[PDB]
Each structure stands twice: as C-alpha cells, then as structure tokens.
Amino acid sequence: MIQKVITVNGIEQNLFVDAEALLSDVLRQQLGLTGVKVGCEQGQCGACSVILDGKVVRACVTKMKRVADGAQITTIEGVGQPENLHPLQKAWVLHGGAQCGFCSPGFIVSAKGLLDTNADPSREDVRDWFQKHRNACRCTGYKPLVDAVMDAAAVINGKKPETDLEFKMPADGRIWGSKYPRPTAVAKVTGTLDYGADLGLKMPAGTLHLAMVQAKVSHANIKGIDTSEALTMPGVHSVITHKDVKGKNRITGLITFPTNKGDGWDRPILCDEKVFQYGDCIALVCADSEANARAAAEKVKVDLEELPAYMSGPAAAAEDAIEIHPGTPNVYFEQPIVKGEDTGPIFASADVTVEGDFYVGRQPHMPIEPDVAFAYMGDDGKCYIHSKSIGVHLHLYMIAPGVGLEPDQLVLVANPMGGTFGYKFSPTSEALVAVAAMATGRPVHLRYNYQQQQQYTGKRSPWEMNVKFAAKKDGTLLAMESDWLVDHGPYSEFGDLLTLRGAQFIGAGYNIPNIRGLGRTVATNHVWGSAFRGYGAPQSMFASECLMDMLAEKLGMDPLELRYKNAYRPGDTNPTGQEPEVFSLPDMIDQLRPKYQAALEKAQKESTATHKKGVGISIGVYGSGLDGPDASEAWAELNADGTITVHTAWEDHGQGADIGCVGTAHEALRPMGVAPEKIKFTWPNTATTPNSGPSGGSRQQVMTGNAIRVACENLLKACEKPGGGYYTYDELKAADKPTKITGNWTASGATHCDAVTGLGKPFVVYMYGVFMAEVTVDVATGQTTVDGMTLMADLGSLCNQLATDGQIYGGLAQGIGLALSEDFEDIKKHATLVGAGFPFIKQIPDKLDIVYVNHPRPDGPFGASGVGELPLTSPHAAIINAIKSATGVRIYRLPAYPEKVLEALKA
C-alpha cells in the first residue's frame, strides 16, 4: 500500500491506495465520487473521463502508480454542482445533451479539458477531441453535445452573457412544443443521479454482491454443478442454483400467441436441464464484493454434455433439425399476410417485376451503462426489485410464477438508467436477483460487465428475407410477395409478435392492393431476441425500401419520384388493410425534393476517381402503441404545497419520460395556470404507480400522454369553483373533496391482426418519415463515410423539441451503425464496443438535419404521435441506397463492411 497526498476537486486528500488499483475504483469506492461513471471498463467509452494534471484520462484504465504525489484531479463533482453549475453544465441542460445522462459527466469533464487547452474550438475541433478521448454516446447522435460545447465556449470567452445559457420562457407560457429543459438534466450533468451501480456502492454493509456462473458453450445437457471450491473462497456467502428457486423456475412469455406451437414457458430463470445459449446463467455466487463473487464464480464447476448448436435461423429451421426445446418444433410460429387478390397471376402479367434476398442481423443495443439490478426483502414481507426494466408491471407478471411469489408480494421499480434501446423490454437480471434475495433474506446486487451486456442480454433478431414487387410501367405498384425467417435465439418471449411486424411493415408507405407473404419464427442457440428500437421495421423496411430503389432502377425512374407515385393518399390502405390516419408522405416528399436534387448535383460535382459520392432515399413508418386497444392510466394530484404530482409508470430509458409527463400535464393544466416547475413526475413502481404500460412501441407519449391529459382535465373539473376560478388545496380539503384524481385512455377501435390473414387495425396512430443519406465511398478500400442525414418527420405535434430532436439524432446514428459497422455474430470478437462496431463521433456526421412536417393526429394528445422508433425504421436503407447511387454496388446483407463493399466493387 502507499500513501499519496493529492488534490481532488480542489481539496487535499490523504489517500491510502494499492498502486495497482484503478483510479475509477479509488474515486468511486474510496472517495464516494459516483459522478465518475463506469461503463465498458476497457478504455473505449470515455464515461470515466477525469482530468489528471491537465490531461483528460480514462480513470478505468489508469492505475494509481500513474498518479504522482501532488497530482491534481477533477471529476464532474469539481466542475460544478446543482446551484453552482459550470457553463458547460448549463449549456448541456439548455441543448438537451443529457438523455439517459450516463455519458454526460465524462463528456463535460472531457470538454472542460478541451476548453482549457483550446478556448475557441471549431465544431470539427470539438469532434476531433471527443474522438481522441473516446467519449461515446448512444442516445444523442453527438450533435447536441457539440452544440453545448460551442455555446459554453462563447460564454467563457465573453462573447455572450452567461444568463443566455438559462432557458427563456416563451411568455405565452406554453411549454408544449418548446425547448424547456428536462427535470432530470441538472442531476445528470452534475453526476448526482444515482444509476444502479451507483446505488450498489451506497447500499449497506449487509448487502451481498452477486456473480453469474455462465455457460461457456452454446448448447448442452447439464449433468451437475459442483460449488465446493467456490464456497471456500474469500468473502463467499453461498452459491444459488435452480434448487433454490421457489416457483416454476421459468419466465413466461405471458402473451404467447394461440397459434404459436410452444407454450411460452421455455425460458429458465436458472438453467436446470439444459444450456440453450452461450452465457446462460447456471448459478449465482453471493459474496461481500463483486470482485470476490467473480473470483469465486470462476471456480464453480459445471458438468455438461455439449450438444450440436444451431447458430443461425436457416440451420435451425431445416426439416431434419433436432428440437432445441424437446416437444416443440424449432419453427414455432408462422404469420401469413393475405391482402386482396392472388399475386401469382398479377406478377405474371405485370409490366415489371423485381425480387431480392436481404438480411439484417443481430444488432447489439450497446448502451453505455451495462445491465445492473438489485433486490431485497422489505420489512413488509414483499420482495423488491430495482432494475433497468422499462415495463415494470409487465415484468412482474412475467417473473412472479417462476420465482414463486404471488403478484402482490413482489414490487418492481425502475432505477435511473443509462439507455436500453429495447433490450429492457425483456427481463434480464430481475428474476436472478429476486431468487437470491428470497433465498438469502439479504439485499443482493448484480452488475454485468460489458462482455456480459453483449453476450447475455437479448438482441435484435436476424431476419432472412425475400421480397418481390410487381408494377406498371408508370411505377404503380400492383402486388407484393414476401417471406421472412426470424432467428429469435432460444427464448420465445415476443418472438411471434416480432414476426407479425413483418406483415405490418414490409412494404409500408405505399398503396399495395394485393399481398401474399409468410413470416416464420425459429428458435436457435444464438442470442435470444429482445426488442431493439424499431422492432421488426428495421428488417422489414430495409428489404422493401431497397427493393423500391431496385424497381426504380428497372423502370428507369427516379427513386424519390417512384415513392411519390405510390405514397399513401386518401382512399389507400396499409398492408393490413387499414386506412392511414393522416396523409403526410406526399407533403414530405415535395418539401424534400429540391434538397434531394441539390444533393445529387453536389455528389456529382464533388466525386473524384477514388472517392465516389451518392444520395439515397427511404421512407419509414411505424405504429405508436402496442397492438390492439392499448391503454394507460395516470393520477393527477394537487399536493398540500400547491404543486401537482402526475403519477404514472412511464419508464425512462433516457428518452424523456420526465419531460413528456411535465410538458403534457402543463398543456392540459393551462386553464388553471400551473407553472411547469410545480409539476412532479413519479419513478415507475408497481406498488405505488398505475399500470401505464411499458415504454415499447413508441407508445408512451400517445397512450400515457392521453391518460395524463385526461387525468389533468379531471383534476381541473375537481378544482373548478362555482362562478369561475379554481379552489385551492386548502379549500378542497376543508370541504372534504378529493385531491388525487384518476384518468384513463384507451385506443378503442384498434384491432389485433388476424392469425390467418394478417389483416387488422393494430395501431390508431403511426409515425411517418422520409430519409435522405449522403455518403462517400472510397472505392480503393470499400469504406463508406456518411456525410449527412436528413429526416422529414411527421410527429403530429411536438411535446418537447429538445426531446424529439435528440430522439431523431440518436436513431439516425444507430442507423449508421446498423448500415455500416454493427453486429453481434462472433460471441467473443463482438463482445466489446470497438469489436461490435459502435459508432464513435467521427462516424456520425455533424450534418444531421430534421424537417418537421406535422399533421395533427386525431387520437394523439394535442395531436401528437410518438417519435422513439421512427428514426431507426429505415435510415440504413437510405444509406445502402446511397452506396448504390455512388458506386453501382448494392449490399443486400448488412452491415456494409469495407471488405464486403470492396469485393462487390471488384467483381
């Protein structure tokens, strides 16, 4: 051990450390500076950035031997605190740079290092700095972060007053539609919002820390588990196996479709008889520390009989393949789509037909924060779970039978969380921590490392697709045929529903009167499927939007004009036979057209012999809602102090559940003159918040926003005075009148798509958009650079423009990754951010352009649709269409890795 006397955030510390200890651990654990966030633990994400002697360093890869006596360290806590915010922190708040907020401390500390060396950076200087310091963000698309740095620099330089970093009220009021900052921003930018790992460090000494004993093969029969050596290791309390599970030891898919051939009870909590994928949790070591738990988990011996594994959909779907779940065929679900007339004769007599085979793969979510959860037995006898769940009520019912609790004896709570992008539509760690809390009686905490985040959380499910169009010479679509095979890994939850998305969204955007297609879901031994932002649309619309460009090419038609010819107009129906609710695609195309023509001219002018530029288009469509007559509930409560709490279970991935609640309630409460800072939101809790439903399907603004609107309207009625005006809290309580008022809303007149035909009215609100990608391909290497993205977006009405702009930039960036670099195919090589192709800042252009073309929705609150998934519906189709424009090469199977593009260029 060594004594080191240094200065941390301006104060002398007398530190006692191991010279080999990591600075991140010393700062977080020894000094309590949980504003130093840790994600990857491998020097690749920048979340743990600190200033050490004037240099920005990643604390997770800096050992204490590199910290000299007398060193100066600055963490986010030393940059500024609430009510003493630094200009960078104020700028972040104003520009909406904290979505999940997990990267915000590291970017802000890194940016302070930049400005202390270059006071007046260009935007490109800022981008270069964040690239060099590996500051990674999965939520924002980086542009808001650069905007904030530039604004802060101007203030620090004396070019504008610091008061200009504070939000100016629009002064009619109306925060609806404004850039009002989100309530959680201050905590995020100061490192004072405790995420699950932070909470673990602040739990009491009795708390047991867990480590998973995981399968290191993809498929096996389990013969036994020997925990004897592990039990003798330092700090070890016990080892938990399936024998300690008090219920069925299975997670239920809960809404497994009747036509599914499986019963939905396929997924174990702790593997008993079989390993189904690499990473499956077979046992839990409980110890005094994460480090001691992990060391002991390495010594647990699992006796296995390895079985041949099916590592893709086509392999598992073969007629003679062995059943992974004995008694259920590997192909466990099929969804037909049958619209209009038989397509064979129409293809036979059509002027033009096209066909293609396409593939979209196993995209990894890659939040900066790896999965984490904890549980404990309450003094009330209930089991409490605090996790990254984005559907607390949903997950309660998915796990309760398996862990052996009645629903009233379990409580699920959503912690603040550093992004999910859908992986948390699935249970991950909740049942594991519940089992351990119940077995030990003690609080338990489980943190995944980044390799476990990659290998052992769910993934976008690969689709192998064939799609065909028949059309007239003038470009009018006549018919479509479609076939898709969905590789869902071994666990069925929501896989049939995902497959149904192909019936809804292959070919969406256009009038197609005659459709014949079939989707199939197959179990495999690769990673299980969890929702990923877009949930079936990124697959579906990659196929159809690429095929639209192929049709345009075969007709000799411009691809934007082909879309204009066919885009939804009154009288048309979507693939499930439903009329669209608004008709904004022609408007959006007309407004994009001159910008597309200018982009084509620029690409021609600026291309060189080696660096070929191109422009690509696509349309995106997605529902806002879960299928059928979805619903939500909210409670609007006048508090004694005159504030109003709007109680919901609107789960915050980081997208803005806080600001969505506040902005929607503010608008509904305007007749009573309620200031926005007087409106409070509630963190999701199954015991004390209503069943607002999960934050999936781009649904909360519509469903929960309408429930909030109705609850607030009902509170206004409850407060209205005879003769005009409103009663105060004191006046209502004096009269023994209610102050906590319910509202509900249902999407009545949605219907679930039929099991035989695929027809129905699954959503009452959709999101519509038109993408344009501008790219350069180096034809010597096959490397593509995306130089610009544009989204024309119809969101109906904006609740909050900082929220919606940020959602769109973040989705566009994930689209660039999906198009060019991302996959989870190689279990080890793709288990790091860099290995799996995470988009660092230079891969995302600074030119991300939005044009809102909002057509108010009949059923949305104040006319709003959702936004969350719109920007990931088809940006990757626009990018691949742009590579084709540039070079003549079409990539059919994502991603467009440089060698793949180069092979195609040279063929």
Ligand X SMILES: *C(=O)CCc1ccccc1
Could you list the residues that contact a second copy (CB under 8 A)? 1-3, 10-19, 21, 26, 29-32, 82-84, 187, 192, 194, 199, 202-206, 235, 288-289, 291, 374, 376-379, 384, 386, 413, 443
From residue 439, give the alpha-carbon distance in Å to each of 207, 209, 242, 395, 435: 14, 14, 11, 20, 6
Q: Which residues are CB-neighbours of 103 under 8 A, at least 6 positions away?
A: 37, 45, 46, 47, 135, 136, 137, 138, 139, 368, 418
State which residue, 144 or 495, has the beta carbon closest to ligand FES. 144
Task: Output phi, psi for 127, to 5 deg.
Answer: -60, -45
Residue 137 assigned to a binding site:
yes
Phi-psi region at 387: left, alpha or beta (left = phi > 0; alpha = psi -120 to 50) = beta
Question: Is the bond leading into 513 cis (omega within 30 degrees of zero)?
Answer: no
For residue 30, give the 3-state DSSP assignment.
helix
Closest approach of Cβ 49 to ligand FES, in Å? 8
Which of 26, 60, 239, 417 forms a contact with ligand FES (CB under 6 A)?
Answer: 60
Which of 92, 195, 310, 425 forms a contact with ligand PCD (CB under 6 A)?
Answer: 425
The structure tokens listed for 137 are: 């963000």
The structure tokens listed for 568 are: 């939804």
Number of CB atoms found within 10 A of residue 556's CB:
7
38 lines the binding site for ligand FES (CB under 6 A): yes
Using CB under 6 A as the binding criterion, the count of chain residues that bind ligand FES stands at: 26
Looking at beta carbons, which residue is closest to ligand X?
755
The structure tokens listed for 822 are: 């991302």
Which of 804, 821, 873, 887 forms a contact with ligand PCD (CB under 6 A)?
Answer: 804
Which of 106, 422, 625, 690 forms a contact with ligand PCD (CB under 6 A)?
Answer: 422
763 lines the binding site for ligand X (CB under 6 A): no
Task: Mark the segment that binds ligand FES (CB under 6 A) among 100-108, 279-287, 292-300, 634-642.
Answer: 100-108
Residue 752 assigned to a binding site:
no
654 lines the binding site for ligand FES (CB under 6 A): yes
Closest residue by Cα to residue 246 from 404, 441, 431, 430: 404
45 lines the binding site for ligand FES (CB under 6 A): yes
CA distance 483 to 520: 8
Residue 653 assigned to a binding site:
yes
Closest approach of Cβ 643 to ligand PCD, in Å? 20
Alpha helices in 720-855 (DSSP H): 729-734, 801-820
Closest residue by Cα to residue 282 from 212, 374, 198: 212
State which residue, 443 or 656, has the beta carbon closest to a second copy. 443
Closest approach of Cβ 274 to ligand FES, in Å? 34
Which of 257, 278, 384, 450 forms a contact with ligand X (CB under 6 A)?
Answer: 257
CA distance 756 to 316: 24
User: Could you identify the residue written with the tokens 């048309």?
Assistant: 572
Window 399-418: residues binding ligand FES (CB under 6 A): 418
Rounded to a whole number, what is the largest CA-CA distance in the chain? 85
Which residue of the set 334, 822, 869, 899 is catalytic? 869
The option from a second copy, ligand X, ligand PCD, none interacting with 844 (CB < 5 to 8 A, set by class) reads none
Integer-rounded Cα Rg, in Å, for the chain is 27
The structure tokens listed for 60 are: 């997770």
Active site residue 579: no
Which of 15, 26, 33, 40 forms a contact with ligand FES (CB under 6 A)?
Answer: 40
The structure tokens listed for 402 are: 């398996």
State which residue, 253 or 268, has the beta carbon closest to ligand X. 253
Window 869-888: residues binding ligand PCD (CB under 6 A): 869
User: Could you identify the residue written with the tokens 């993408």?
Assistant: 771
Q: What is the DSSP string of 400-453?
A: HHHHT--GGGEEEEEPP-S--TTGGGS-SSHHHHHHHHHHHSS-EEEE--HHHH
101 lines the binding site for ligand FES (CB under 6 A): yes
CA distance 376 to 436: 9
Q: Which residues are CB-neighbours of 141 under 8 A, at least 6 positions away?
A: 806, 808, 809, 810, 811, 812, 813, 844, 848
CA distance 53 to 615: 46
The structure tokens listed for 622 are: 């997605």
From residue 704, give the alpha-carbon distance in Å to each of 156, 454, 664: 41, 31, 10
Window 86-115: residues binding ligand PCD (CB under 6 A): 99-100
Which of 49, 335, 455, 698 forms a contact with ligand PCD (CB under 6 A)?
Answer: 698
Alpha helices in 801-894 (DSSP H): 801-820, 875-887
Closest approach of Cβ 531 to ligand X, in Å? 16
588 lines the binding site for ligand PCD (CB under 6 A): no
Window 314-373: residues binding ligand FES (CB under 6 A): 368
The option from a second copy, ligand X, ligand PCD, none interacting with 384 (CB < 5 to 8 A, set by class) reads a second copy
Using CB under 6 A as the binding criterion, the count of chain residues that bind ligand PCD stands at: 42
> Residues 155-174: x/- map of binding to ligand X (CB under 6 A)?
--------------------
Residue 281 assigned to a binding site:
no
Residue 271 assigned to a binding site:
no
Rounded to 5°, the CA angle 435-440-441 comes to 95
Task: Mark the segment that binds ligand FES (CB under 6 A) among 43-51, 347-355, 775-783, 896-904.
Answer: 43-51
Residue 719 assigned to a binding site:
no
799 lines the binding site for ligand PCD (CB under 6 A): yes
CA distance 200 to 209: 9
Window 519-548: residues binding ligand PCD (CB under 6 A): 531-533, 535
Which of 199, 203, 291, 755 forms a contact with ligand X (CB under 6 A)?
Answer: 755
Contact between residue 428 and residue 383 where contact means Cβ atoms under 8 Å apart: no
Binding site for Cl ion (CB under 5 A): 891-893, 897-899
Residue 100 assigned to a binding site:
yes
From residue 426, give the alpha-carbon distance in Å to each of 387, 388, 394, 417, 471: 12, 10, 9, 15, 41
State which residue, 204 or 571, has the beta carbon closest to a second copy. 204
The structure tokens listed for 727 are: 């009663």
The option from ligand FES, Cl ion, ligand X, none interacting with 898 (CB < 5 to 8 A, set by class) reads Cl ion
The structure tokens listed for 443 are: 């609080």
419 lines the binding site for ligand FES (CB under 6 A): yes
3-state helix, strand, coil in the chain (%, to 5): 35, 25, 45
Closest approach of Cβ 386 to ligand X, in Å? 29
100 lines the binding site for ligand FES (CB under 6 A): yes
Q: Which residues are CB-neighbours of 200 under 8 A, at least 6 positions away?
A: 207, 209, 372, 374, 445, 447
The option from ligand PCD, ligand X, a second copy, none interacting with 235 (CB < 5 to 8 A, set by class) reads a second copy
Task: Mark the segment that binds ligand FES (CB under 6 A) among 13-21, 137-145, 281-289, 623-631.
Answer: 137-145
From residue 772, give the alpha-carbon distance in Å to each of 144, 617, 619: 20, 5, 9
Closest approach of Cβ 781 to Cl ion, in Å? 9
Residue 661 assigned to a binding site:
no
The option from ligand X, Cl ion, ligand PCD, none interacting with 98 (CB < 5 to 8 A, set by class) reads none
Residue 103 assigned to a binding site:
yes
Strand ordering across the sheet containing 631-638: 679-681, 644-647, 631-638, 740-746
- Residue positions annotated with a catalytic role: 869
Binding residues for ligand FES, rule: CB under 6 A, are: 38-41, 43-48, 58, 60, 98-103, 137-140, 368, 418-419, 654
Q: Which residue ranges are tagged as binding site for [2Fe-2S] cluster? A: 40, 45, 48, 60, 100, 103, 137, 139
Q: Which residue ranges are tagged as binding site? A: 40, 45, 48, 60, 100, 103, 137, 139, 653, 869
Q: Which residue ranges are tagged as binding site for Mo-molybdopterin cytosine dinucleotide? A: 653, 869
Binding residues for ligand X, rule: CB under 6 A, are: 255, 257-258, 752, 755
Binding residues for ligand PCD, rule: CB under 6 A, are: 99-100, 139, 390, 419-422, 425, 531-533, 535, 653-657, 659-660, 695-701, 795-796, 798-800, 803-804, 807, 810, 864-869
